[PDB]
Enzyme design. Structure first.
Site, PDB file in Angstrom:
ATOM      1  N   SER D  46       0.745  -1.064   0.157  1.00  0.00           N
ATOM      2  CA  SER D  46      -0.031   0.155  -0.213  1.00  0.00           C
ATOM      3  C   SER D  46       1.318   1.183  -0.657  1.00  0.00           C
ATOM      4  O   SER D  46       0.060   2.203  -0.065  1.00  0.00           O
ATOM      5  CB  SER D  46      -0.784   0.415   1.148  1.00  0.00           C
ATOM      6  OG  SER D  46      -1.369  -1.225   1.142  1.00  0.00           O
ATOM      7  N   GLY D 242      -1.366   2.591  -4.919  1.00  0.00           N
ATOM      8  CA  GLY D 242      -2.303   3.729  -5.733  1.00  0.00           C
ATOM      9  C   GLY D 242      -4.047   4.038  -6.098  1.00  0.00           C
ATOM     10  O   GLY D 242      -4.585   3.701  -5.355  1.00  0.00           O
ATOM     11  N   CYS D 268      -9.968  -2.889   1.435  1.00  0.00           N
ATOM     12  CA  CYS D 268      -8.682  -1.221   0.879  1.00  0.00           C
ATOM     13  C   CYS D 268      -9.167  -1.131  -0.477  1.00  0.00           C
ATOM     14  O   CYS D 268      -9.964  -0.865  -0.658  1.00  0.00           O
ATOM     15  CB  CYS D 268      -7.318  -1.632   1.546  1.00  0.00           C
ATOM     16  SG  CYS D 268      -6.335  -0.167   1.060  1.00  0.00           S
ATOM     17  N   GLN D 272     -12.705  -0.464  -3.304  1.00  0.00           N
ATOM     18  CA  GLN D 272     -12.882   0.498  -3.903  1.00  0.00           C
ATOM     19  C   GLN D 272     -13.605  -0.122  -4.683  1.00  0.00           C
ATOM     20  O   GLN D 272     -14.531   0.069  -5.578  1.00  0.00           O
ATOM     21  CB  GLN D 272     -11.570   1.325  -4.027  1.00  0.00           C
ATOM     22  CG  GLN D 272     -11.468   1.947  -2.502  1.00  0.00           C
ATOM     23  CD  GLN D 272     -10.486   2.945  -2.314  1.00  0.00           C
ATOM     24  OE1 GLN D 272      -9.157   2.760  -2.498  1.00  0.00           O
ATOM     25  NE2 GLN D 272     -10.961   3.510  -0.904  1.00  0.00           N
ATOM     26  N   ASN D 310      -4.786   2.620   6.212  1.00  0.00           N
ATOM     27  CA  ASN D 310      -3.912   2.594   4.884  1.00  0.00           C
ATOM     28  C   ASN D 310      -4.212   2.941   3.433  1.00  0.00           C
ATOM     29  O   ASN D 310      -4.025   1.559   2.251  1.00  0.00           O
ATOM     30  CB  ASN D 310      -2.493   1.741   4.876  1.00  0.00           C
ATOM     31  CG  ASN D 310      -2.209   1.027   5.501  1.00  0.00           C
ATOM     32  OD1 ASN D 310      -3.042   0.558   6.143  1.00  0.00           O
ATOM     33  ND2 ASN D 310      -1.007   1.630   6.649  1.00  0.00           N
ATOM     34  N   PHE D 313      -7.123   7.235  -0.914  1.00  0.00           N
ATOM     35  CA  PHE D 313      -8.556   7.477  -2.061  1.00  0.00           C
ATOM     36  C   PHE D 313      -9.654   6.897  -0.888  1.00  0.00           C
ATOM     37  O   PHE D 313      -9.282   5.758  -0.516  1.00  0.00           O
ATOM     38  CB  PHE D 313      -8.176   6.920  -3.253  1.00  0.00           C
ATOM     39  CG  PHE D 313      -7.575   6.838  -4.091  1.00  0.00           C
ATOM     40  CD1 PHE D 313      -7.667   8.161  -5.192  1.00  0.00           C
ATOM     41  CD2 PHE D 313      -6.854   6.396  -4.390  1.00  0.00           C
ATOM     42  CE1 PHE D 313      -6.892   8.192  -5.881  1.00  0.00           C
ATOM     43  CE2 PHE D 313      -4.973   7.072  -4.797  1.00  0.00           C
ATOM     44  CZ  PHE D 313      -5.176   7.589  -5.276  1.00  0.00           C
ATOM     45  N   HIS D 352      -7.690  -1.563   6.966  1.00  0.00           N
ATOM     46  CA  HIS D 352      -7.559  -2.779   7.377  1.00  0.00           C
ATOM     47  C   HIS D 352      -7.415  -4.387   8.370  1.00  0.00           C
ATOM     48  O   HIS D 352      -7.385  -3.686   9.549  1.00  0.00           O
ATOM     49  CB  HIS D 352      -5.856  -3.018   7.424  1.00  0.00           C
ATOM     50  CG  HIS D 352      -5.229  -2.689   5.619  1.00  0.00           C
ATOM     51  ND1 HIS D 352      -4.681  -2.502   5.318  1.00  0.00           N
ATOM     52  CD2 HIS D 352      -5.751  -1.815   5.332  1.00  0.00           C
ATOM     53  CE1 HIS D 352      -3.939  -1.769   4.374  1.00  0.00           C
ATOM     54  NE2 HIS D 352      -4.747  -2.016   3.756  1.00  0.00           N
ATOM     55  N   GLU D 354      -7.400  -7.383  11.535  1.00  0.00           N
ATOM     56  CA  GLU D 354      -6.422  -7.528  12.365  1.00  0.00           C
ATOM     57  C   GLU D 354      -6.986  -8.303  13.116  1.00  0.00           C
ATOM     58  O   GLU D 354      -7.792  -8.726  13.736  1.00  0.00           O
ATOM     59  CB  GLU D 354      -5.198  -6.834  12.401  1.00  0.00           C
ATOM     60  CG  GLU D 354      -3.942  -6.781  12.389  1.00  0.00           C
ATOM     61  CD  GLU D 354      -3.344  -6.603  13.518  1.00  0.00           C
ATOM     62  OE1 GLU D 354      -3.117  -6.367  14.579  1.00  0.00           O
ATOM     63  OE2 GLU D 354      -2.355  -5.215  12.660  1.00  0.00           O
TER      64      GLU D 354
END
Ligand code: CL
Ligand code: CL
Ligand code: CL
Ligand code: CL
Ligand code: CL
Ligand code: CL
Ligand code: K
Ligand code: K
EC number: 6.3.5.5
Lengths: 375, 358, 358, 375
Positions: D46, D242, D268, D272, D310, D313, D352, D354
Site C-alpha cells: 500500500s 495507488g 481497502c 474500492q 492505509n 482515496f 485493514h 487484524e
C-alpha cells in the site's frame, strides 16, 4: 555462521569464515610473508587475478586508510588469512579491514591453516584456486572453477590494469607529520619522466617525484613515437601483474627507446620487459617472490639489500644477451634481480624499491637523466 | 610473561616500575595471540590454568580492588584485567586505567565471554565444535574443567573422544618460505602437523622446569641439558620439553627434538601420545616436573629413574618418617598439630626452639 | 520521575521497593527520550541540572559505591548510572546490576560522552552547531555551564547570540492529525513554533512549584489555580507554568495557556521571551518560584506583587531582624556563631534552651 | 556527517541525516501515526511510490525481523523519521533498522521536524517530494525531481505490485509461542478462496487461512473467466497501492462475478473496486488515512472499532448506487468505510483487518462462503 571456502586445483580444501563480500573468487594462489603492509599489498596492481594468502596470522590489526592505498583499487582477487582481529587499533585507521573488503567487494576468508597452505604452494608451486563465500559453499563448484581457471602463464595482465588515457603525476611521498603532500606544480620539478603504466604502484611514483621528476603516466600500449614526441628526460617502466612476454606492444616500444640515448629505468615487470627487449628470456617461477625481507646482493658493491618482492616470473640469467650486465641477484634463490645495458643508459631491478627518503637505483636513474640533459 | 617472587619478600613494595623485580620468565608460541597468551599463562608455574579469577563475583568490594590492581600494576594484573571484564568494566574502562592497548584488551575480554558460556552450558554443552573453538583459543583442559565443574581428566577424555588434539608446527625463521631440517616445535589447534616423529629410534624425553624462580634456578636447567647431551651422545633420540626462553635447554642445538611447550600434564601427554618415547625424566627440572610424576605415570607415561612413588615416599613427611624409623636413623622431634593449644602441648613434648612448617 | 524526601526521614530504609515511598513526581515532555529525560531531571527540584555527578572521578571507592547504588536502587540511582558510565562501566555491566532496559542506558551513556566533550572543549568548543546539538539532547544552560566552567548566564548569552532558542509544540492527542484550539505546549529545540502568542490581551503568568515534596504541597497549587481562575475571570490572559502531573494547575482548563515545563530560570525566561507578559506572579507556588524571583526580575521579568527584594527583606534573618528592630517589636534573642566555643558563649548570653538553625 | 535532505513540491526543505541507502527517492509524501509497527508499514505494498513519514519520534526501537514483513519486500519509497535509536532492544530483533534500510536499499533521513512535516501535509494536503541522501545533496535538484514527479492521482500501482503468476497460500497467523506456523495442507482447508493480489498484505492472507480458506493468489489482470474456472468458494480482492479508478482490468472482472452468486469480499483497494464495479465513484483524499488508531462505526450495530488505515482515496458516499449499502463510516471524518450489495453476496471494508484472533467482516465472509456451498 558465515561460511567460506577455499579450494585448490589439486582438490585441497580449507574450510573457514567469510570476512569479505559474498560470492566466489578465482585466481592463482600465492602466499606473502609480509608481517605488516597488508593494505598496500591488496591494492598493489601487481596482484591482479591473484588470491593472496598472508602468512602472518593476524591481518587487519591496524585497520586501513587511504594513504596506504597503492592504487585506486583493490587488485587482489581474494584474501586468505588465519585470523581477523576483533578490532583495528591504530591512530591511522579509518575503517576496519572487513568493512573495507566489503566496500571493495572482495571475497575473503579467515580462520584456515595458512601454514599448511603455504607449505603446499612452496612444495608444489603455485596453484589456481577458488574461494567461495556464502550460505552453503559448494566445494565441487569451487574445484570446478579452480581447475577451469585459465592461469597466469601467458596472460597479459598489464593491458588490464593500465590507465586508459595518459595523465600527470606530481605528488610525492607521505610523511608522518603531514600525511600525503599536495601535488607539486610543474615548475616545481626539473625533470620530466614518462612512465609506462603496466600496473604501477603509487609509492614509486611518489618516490620519483621526490627526486625532481614531473611524471606523465602513459597507457601500456603507448607507442614509442608517441612518447618520444614528448621529449622525455627519462623513461620509466613500471611494475605490474602477470606475464611480461605477451607484451608485444611494450617490447617493441622499448626497443625503440633503446636506439635512442634516453635513459631507461625499469622496476619489476618493467625490468622484465627491458630484459625481453634486450633479447633476454623470461620464466615463470615455481611460486615466486612475495614478501618484504628478501635479501638481494648488489654484486658490484658486494652489499645485501633487504627487499620487497612481488613477482611470479623472472629473467633467465643463462640467456642473458651480452649487452646485459647482471647487477643484482637473490640471496634466497640465486635468481636474477638486476641488470644494466653495457651499451645504453638503461637498467632495471626485479624488486620494489622504497623511500627513507639507500636509493642507489633511483639515484642512478636521476644521475643518468642529468648527464642526458647535460648533453 | 615475567615470573615474580614477591611472596618471598616481606615488606617489599610489590608494584611494577622501571626497576626490574622479576626473577624469570616464560615464553609461549601460538598461532594466535589468544592461544599464545593462554599457553604462556598455564606455563607460568604459578598455579594458573589461564585467566583464573582473583576476586569473587559477589564481593561488593571487588570493583575497588580491581581498580587498584589495574591502575597500579603488580605481578597480578593480567588476572585482574579479566576479573574487571567479569565485573562489568568496559574495554575503554580498562584501557584508561592501564594504558594497555585495546588490541590486547579486546582479546582478553573475548576469552571472558567465552568462559561465561562455558560456565553456562556446562560439560554437556561442550560439543566438539565448541570445544575445538575453545582449544583453538588456547583454553586449557584445566581451566575448562573448572568452569564446567569437572576434573581436568574429564575434559581431556572428551577430547580423546572427539579426537581433538593439537598439531605441531615448526619454527623456521621464514614463515615456511623454506623448509627446515630442525625439529623446534610448538603445539596449536590447526590442520596440518609437522611433528613427523621418527619410528627409527629409542627416545628419551627430558622435562624442564618452566620459568626460573627462586629455588628453581639454572641449576636444574643445567641438569636437564646434561641429560640430553649425554643420552644423545650415547645414541638416544633426545626430546626436550620446556618453555624458558632464557636457557640452553631451549636452544635447538641442545637436543634432537625441541618442544617449546608448557610443562604441564596436558602438554606433556600430547607429545607423549605422538612420540611414544622409551623413557621420560622427571627428576631434573625441579618441582615443576616432579609434581607431574604421578599423573604422568598413571596416564601411562614411561617415567624413568626413581619412581614417582619412591619420590613421594621421600617427599611425604609421614610416609617418610616411617622410612627413617625403618632404617633406625636420627630425625628431629616432630609433631603434627591442628589446633593452637594442641601445639603448645606438643611443643612442650618436642622442646624449643621449634621449626613451624605449614 | 518520582520525588522523594528521605532526608526528612532519619532511620528510614531508603532503598526502593514494592512499597511506595515517594512524596510527589515530575513530568516532562520532549521530542526525544533524552530531551524528555533531561528536562524532567532539571524540573525535579532537587538541585539537579541534569546528570550532575554524585561521586568523584578520582575516588578510589567510587566504583564500589556506584555498584551498590546500582544494584540496590535508591532515590539517586539515576545519577549513579551516569556516574557508572563516567567510571568506566559498560552498558552491559549497568544492565546486569539494574535490569534497566539497555535502550535507555545507551542514551544515558551517550549523554555522558557528550558531556565529556564539553568538558574538553570548554566554552570555546561551544560553537553554534554543537550547542544546538546539545540543546536538542535536553542539555540545560546550567549543566553545560558547570562542564565548561562558566556561569549559566554565559551559556544563555551564548544562545542569544546564536539566536538559539526552543520552539513550542502543542499536545493534541493525535500526533498532529487534527488541529487543536487548546494551548497546551512544551518546549523543544526544533524548527516550527506553535506558540503564536497573542498581541491581543494583557497576560499574566503564574509560576507553579514543580513536583510535590513535604512542605511544598497542594496548598500552593491551590493558590496557583485560584490566581488563574481569578484573573481569567477578570479578563486577563492567564498563562500557567508548571510540570507537576498530579495537579489541577496542569489541567489545560485551568488557564488560557499552559506551558508544561520545568520551573527554572531558563525555561521561564524562554516563555517570557515570547509571551512578553504584563506580569508574573512568583509568590504562589512556594519555594520553587520564590527562589527565582530575584533572577527573573534582574533579567527584566515583570514580577508583580510583593517585590523580590521585599521578600528578601523578610527571608533574610538579618535583613529582617533589623526591621523587626525598626518596628520596635519582640523577637527572640538570637546570635550567629561560627565556632563551637564561640557558641557555648553566645549561648550563655541568649540562654537555653536553644534553637540551632544551620 | 552523512547528510540527507527532503524537499517538497512546494519548495519546503527538511535538512537531516542519512540513515538508509545513498541516493535519491521521490514520491508522494505521507504521514503515519503508528507508534509501533514500522517494519510492517514499510513492507506494506500500500505504500509503493510513497515516501513515508512517521509521527512517532523514535523509529527502530525494536529493530526488525522477518516475522514482521508484510510482503516480500519494502514498498515505501523513502522513510522520514525524527530519531533513529542508538540500538534496537528487543528479543525479536534480527537486524537494526539502519542496516535493514540499506540492504533493501531505502533512501532514508532521520532528524527532521516530522511535526512540522505532519502539520503541513495535514493543512495543505499530500505532496510529492524528494529525498536526497548523499555527500552534498542538491536542493534545487531535489526540488526539480519533486516537482517533476508525476503523482499518484490516476496512477495504477496495483499492476506494479501484483505477482507474475498465480499461487497457493496456506499459511496461517503468527503466535508468540510458535511464531510463523508451517503452511497447512490443501486437504486441511475446507474452503477455496481466490484472491486478486492488488498488492496484498501477508497477514490478511494469514487471517483467511486461519478461517479455513485455501488460497489461490492470482495476478491483478486475471480474467473472471479464468477465475470462475477454478470453482472458487469465494473471491477475495486484496489491498494495494495507488489509484483504483485506472484498474479497468478488475472492475471488469469483478462485475462478472457480480452476476454470479459467488461471495465476494473486498479490503481497502478491493473495497474500492467493488464499489466501482457496482457503479460507485472514487475520489482522492486530501491527506488520506494512515495509522492505527482510527475509529470506525458499524452503523448497523452502533459500535465503534479502532482500526488500522492505509489509504489515499475513498468511495464517494453521495454517488452510491441503491444496491450499495453503507456498512461503516469513519468517526474521524465521516468518510465511507464499508459497503454491502443489497442484491449480492458482496461487501467490502475500507480499513485493514487484524487478528486477535474485521472478524465480523471476515466471519461474515465465511458465513457467506458457507451459505453458498450449502447451495
Ligand atoms: Cl584449514
Ligand atoms: Cl598527481
Ligand atoms: Cl556451542
Ligand atoms: Cl523504614
Ligand atoms: Cl563540535
Ligand atoms: Cl527540519
Ligand atoms: K578452520
Ligand atoms: K623439600
Amino acid at each position: 555462521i558465515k561460511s567460506a571456502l577455499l579450494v585448490l586445483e589439486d582438490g585441497t580444501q580449507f574450510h573457514g569464515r567469510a570476512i569479505g563480500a559474498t560470492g566466489s573468487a578465482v585466481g592463482e594462489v600465492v602466499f606473502n610473508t609480509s608481517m605488516t603492509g597488508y593494505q598496500e599489498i591488496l591494492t598493489d596492481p601487481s596482484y591482479s587475478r591473484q588470491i593472496v594468502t598472508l602468512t602472518y596470522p593476524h591481518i587487519g590489526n591496524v585497520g586501513t586508510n587511504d594513504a596506504d592505498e597503492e592504487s585506486s583499487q583493490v587488485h587482489a582477487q581474494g584474501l586468505v588469512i588465519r585470523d581477523l582481529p576483533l578490532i583495528a587499533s591504530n591512530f591511522r585507521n579509518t575503517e576496519d579491514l572487513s568493512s573495507y573488503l566489503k566496500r571493495h567487494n572482495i571475497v575473503a576468508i579467515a580462520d584456515i591453516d595458512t601454514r599448511k597452505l603455504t607449505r603446499l604452494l612452496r612444495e608444489k608451486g603455485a596453484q589456481n584456486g577458488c574461494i567461495i563465500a556464502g550460505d552453503n559453499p559448494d566445494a565441487a563448484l569451487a574445484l570446478e572453477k579452480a581447475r577451469a581457471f585459465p592461469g597466469l602463464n601467458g596472460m597479459d595482465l598489464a593491458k588490464e590494469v593500465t590507465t586508459a588515457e595518459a595523465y600527470s603525476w606530481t605528488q610525492g611521498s607521505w610523511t608522518l607529520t603531514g600525511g600525503l603532500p599536495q601535488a607539486k606544480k610543474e615548475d616545481e620539478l626539473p625533470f620530466h619522466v614518462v612512465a609506462y603504466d603496466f600496473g604501477a604502484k603509487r609509492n614509486i611514483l611518489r618516490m620519483l617525484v621526490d627526486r625532481g621528476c614531473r611524471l606523465t603516466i602513459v597507457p601500456a600500449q603507448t607507442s614509442a613515437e608517441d612518447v618520444l614526441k614528448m621529449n622525455p628526460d627519462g623513461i620509466f617502466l613500471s611494475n605490474g601483474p602477470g606475464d611480461p612476454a605477451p607484451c608485444d606492444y611494450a617490447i617493441t616500444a622499448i626497443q625503440k627507446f633503446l636506439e635512442t640515448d634516453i635513459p631507461v629505468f625499469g622496476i619489476c615487470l618493467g625490468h622484465q620487459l627491458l630484459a625481453l627487449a634486450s633479447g633476454a628470456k623470461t620464466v615463470k617461477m615455481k611460486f615466486g617472490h612475495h614478501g618484504g625481507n628478501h635479501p638481494v646482493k648488489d654484486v658490484e658493491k658486494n652489499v645485501v639489500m633487504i627487499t620487497a618482492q612481488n613477482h611470479g616470473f623472472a629473467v633467465d640469467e643463462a640467456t642473458l644477451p651480452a649487452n646485459l650486465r647482471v647487477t643484482h641477484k637473490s640471496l634466497f634463490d640465486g635468481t636474477l634481480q638486476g641488470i644494466h645495458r653495457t651499451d645504453k643508459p638503461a637498467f632495471s631491478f626485479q624488486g620494489h624499491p622504497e623511500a627513507s627518503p639507500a636509493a642507489p637505483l633511483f639515484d642512478h636513474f636521476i644521475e643518468l637523466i642529468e648527464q642526458y640533459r647535460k648533453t | 610473561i615475567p615470573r615474580f617472587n614477591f611472596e618471598k619478600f616481606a615488606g617489599a613494595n610489590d608494584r611494577l616500575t622501571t626497576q626490574m623485580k622479576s626473577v624469570g620468565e616464560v615464553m609461549a608460541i601460538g598461532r594466535t595471540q589468544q592461544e599464545s597468551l593462554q599457553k604462556a599463562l598455564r606455563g607460568l608455574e604459578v598455579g594458573a590454568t589461564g585467566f583464573d579469577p582473583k576476586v569473587s563475583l559477589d564481593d561488593p568490594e571487588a570493583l575497588t580492588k580491581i581498580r587498584r590492581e589495574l591502575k597500579d600494576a603488580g605481578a597480578d594484573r593480567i588476572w585482574y584485567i579479566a576479573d574487571a571484564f567479569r565485573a562489568g568494566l568496559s574495554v575503554d574502562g580498562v584501557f584508561n586505567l592501564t594504558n594497555i592497548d585495546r588490541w590486547f584488551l579486546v582479546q582478553i575480554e573475548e576469552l571472558v565471554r567465552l568462559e561465561e558460556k562455558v560456565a553456562e552450558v556446562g560439560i554437556t554443552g561442550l560439543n566438539a565444535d565448541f570445544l575445538r573453538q575453545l582449544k583453538r583459543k588456547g583454553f586449557a583442559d584445566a581451566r575448562l574443567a573448572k568452569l564446567a565443574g569437572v576434573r581436568e581428566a574429564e575434559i581431556r577424555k572428551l577430547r580423546d573422544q572427539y579426537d581433538l588434539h593439537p598439531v605441531y608446527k615448526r619454527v623456521d625463521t621464514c614463515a615456511a618460505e623454506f623448509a627446515t631440517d630442525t625439529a623446534y616445535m610448538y603445539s596449536t589447534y590447526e590442520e596440518e602437523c609437522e611433528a613427523n616423529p621418527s619410528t627409527d629410534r629409542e627416545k628419551i624425553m627430558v622435562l624442564g622446569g618452566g620459568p626460573n624462580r627462586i629455588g628453581q634456578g639454572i641449576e636444574f636447567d643445567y641438569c636437564c641439558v646434561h641429560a640430553s647431551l649425554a643420552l644423545r651422545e650415547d645414541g638416544y633420540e633426545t626430546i626436550m620439553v620446556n618453555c624458558n626462553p632464557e636457557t640452553v635447554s631451549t636452544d635447538y642445538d641442545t637436543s634432537d627434538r625441541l618442544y617449546f611447550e608448557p610443562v604441564t600434564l596436558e602438554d606433556v601427554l600430547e607429545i607423549v601420545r605422538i612420540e611414544k618415547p622409551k623413557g621420560v625424566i622427571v627428576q631434573y627440572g625441579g618441582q615443576t616436573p616432579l609434581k607431574l610424576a604421578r599423573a604422568l605415570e598413571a596416564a601411562g607415561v614411561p617415567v624413568i629413574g626413581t619412581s614417582p612413588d619412591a619420590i613421594d615416599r621421600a617427599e611425604d613427611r609421614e610416609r617418610f618418617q616411617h622410612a627413617v624409623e625403618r632404617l633406625k636413623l636420627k630425625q628431629p622431634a616432630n609433631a603434627t598439630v591442628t589446633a593452637i593449644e594442641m601445639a603448645v602441648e606438643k611443643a612442650k613434648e618436642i622442646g624449643y626452639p621449634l621449626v613451624v612448617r605449614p
